[PDB]
Scaffold this active site. Sequence first.
Site, mmCIF file in Angstrom:
data_model
loop_
_atom_site.group_PDB
_atom_site.id
_atom_site.type_symbol
_atom_site.label_atom_id
_atom_site.label_comp_id
_atom_site.label_asym_id
_atom_site.label_seq_id
_atom_site.Cartn_x
_atom_site.Cartn_y
_atom_site.Cartn_z
ATOM 1 C CB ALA C 64 -0.926 -0.025 1.198
ATOM 2 N N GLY C 104 2.077 -6.750 0.848
ATOM 3 C CA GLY C 104 1.006 -6.592 -0.330
ATOM 4 C C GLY C 104 1.347 -7.493 -1.576
ATOM 5 C CD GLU C 107 -1.856 -9.008 2.294
ATOM 6 O OE1 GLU C 107 -1.469 -7.809 2.287
ATOM 7 O OE2 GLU C 107 -2.857 -9.232 2.962
ATOM 8 C CD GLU C 127 1.384 -7.125 5.927
ATOM 9 O OE1 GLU C 127 1.968 -8.126 6.286
ATOM 10 O OE2 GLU C 127 0.983 -6.795 4.672
#
Lengths: 260, 256, 256
Positions: C64, C104, C107, C127
């Site tokens: 992000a 990210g 993911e 995270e």
Amino acid sequence: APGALAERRGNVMVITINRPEARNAVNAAVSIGVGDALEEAQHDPEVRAVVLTGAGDKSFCAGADLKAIARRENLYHPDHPEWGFAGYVRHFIDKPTIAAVNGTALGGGTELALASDLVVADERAQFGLPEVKRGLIAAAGGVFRIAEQLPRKVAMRLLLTGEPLSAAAARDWGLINEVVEAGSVLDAALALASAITVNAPLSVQASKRIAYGVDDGVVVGDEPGWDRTMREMRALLKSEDAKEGPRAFAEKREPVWQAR
Amino acid sequence: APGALAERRGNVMVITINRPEARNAVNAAVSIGVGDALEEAQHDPEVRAVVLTGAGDKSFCAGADLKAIARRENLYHPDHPEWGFAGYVRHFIDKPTIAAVNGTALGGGTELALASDLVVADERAQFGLPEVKRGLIAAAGGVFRIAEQLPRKVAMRLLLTGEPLSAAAARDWGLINEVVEAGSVLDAALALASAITVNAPLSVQASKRIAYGVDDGVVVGDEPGWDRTMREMRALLKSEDAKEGPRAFEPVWQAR
Amino acid sequence: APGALAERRGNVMVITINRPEARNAVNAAVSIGVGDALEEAQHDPEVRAVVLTGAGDKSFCAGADLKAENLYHPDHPEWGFAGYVRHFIDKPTIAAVNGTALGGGTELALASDLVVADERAQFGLPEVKRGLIAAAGGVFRIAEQLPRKVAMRLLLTGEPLSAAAARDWGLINEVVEAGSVLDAALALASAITVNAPLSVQASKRIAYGVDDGVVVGDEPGWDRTMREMRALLKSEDAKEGPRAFAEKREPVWQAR
């Protein structure tokens, strides 16, 4: 000649697919023989394990019989469609099952292996789900079992590319239990059966039922996979492309798919 | 003597099964010690991780105590049957759990490793589920967890044959996280714990809950497994084989 | 420039995240381009597979965009991160991980059907080190796609896996040398696009348990993720995490 043979070796029933001239491809006659032998194994308390293998030194099972598919002949047990492909893939029994993969195990053949509790394989044996290369899918459980039994990404590659997997790579991934020297898979599979049959049979059988989540005979977690497999099959059968796999093979050429 | 000891190493709680003369076999005393410790760990925000281990240099946990079973003793926490075996296998807590396997970890002992979040093993450690050789089953979660944590076919051979698995092979399959030098497992487990306790605790704890599918302290996806294990085990204790299996010593099965 | 580009190479759609100066960090524009392209892929019968990759040779996706403003597709927030991670399509997807992929990017890899990676790439979910969690599917998918114990270490420590180690566990399919990741992904794509597309696509839907374009088994994962994130997002610790990095010091957690 029956499509499959059944014989006893002590407390083990050995079921042998008996169409070596057709690379032990599964048709209705194979399903009758395998299916009936599995059901005799379930109800005989003297049988403590089952071994499934193919006749000869070349093929475990090359897949669903494609000439039978072209002839619109049903492949399954005429009296027991609920047992699925080969009277085997949707035929839960309490007794442990071992695939002794003596050679080629492609498509339906790999699906027999997935459906079995354990697998021992000849080092020359090849596994895979090439159904997608000829306009079919792995409808005998392959499509939802492969990702239960291999890591997700490894399973998806196999399923979507249709490319084969060596016995050694299968074993390395934990898809099969052991790889043995050429020609020795039956004896290796009986030795594995003995390592099970010395155990308390009620314990082994309770263990199996819990491990698959079996309630009143049914592997309940599999039902959504079967239902979706049936649902999809119906849309595929109507498609123009459904004509092209067989049509291409018949014309000695590569298929030209339209996605319709 | 208490069945298990609990102590602090910084922000880690170390729970030690304390029946080394019985090879750290689980009885009611152990379930009381281990269970009370986990619940204390759950409710103390200073505890960021838990390590479970066995007293001594030979055994993590030999399994369910067979002499307790033969006497029809209840093995679980008397006030918390719902926590299951060792007050541990069905006792979800938010803090991460590491099995520091210092030796033998068979049957019930392997079930404690399965129930834990992470496992670090002494190279001498043996895992396995030999219950089927004794006319019983892996009733403390093993029969449904083993196929969730190992490739199906590999899990199935362990379950049906009852044969042991080395620590090296357990690591190769990814059933445990690391294999370490003899004698060093507790220190190895503590170093692993610190790689976790340095992180934001609510983060770690939320990740644990999502990864296991926890709603209100219950691992929702395990409940059918428990239900099936319970109903199968009821019938199975009524069989003669379940009595013949122990009290040997080469058993003779009548499939009844 | 557009946040991502879409181009045809035969029957493959290549979707390139187009923000190399920002390390291909995801913002709204990226989500718009990626999401829109997937939807074009879904409805174009000629597109038989999709490859997702990053522009340049240093980064697949940085995560992000830390200079965050919404990051999702304004018209389709239900697709989640990058218009990608909750956006099933019939056509097989290959992540071509051409650089760093921590958080990210991991993911995106988890969301894709297949993954080809640079040997430099690392896969992880760090995270938990900063007070939040892998909210773009990572927490529930990592346990589905790695062996349980290995997934739990990754999730709880927040430490990365090498591309080679990811490949050894079966989390990704192929590891190649820097510069040719896209080539290797297109070769993989061709091994799929040669096959009967309706059979391939039906196989994908069944393999994921898809009913009407929804991966039904993911929904409890999404729901638990959002529930947990709501509490995380108010916590004092989720302030302490970025406040500490910024000030070049170790964070002090309160677990609140």
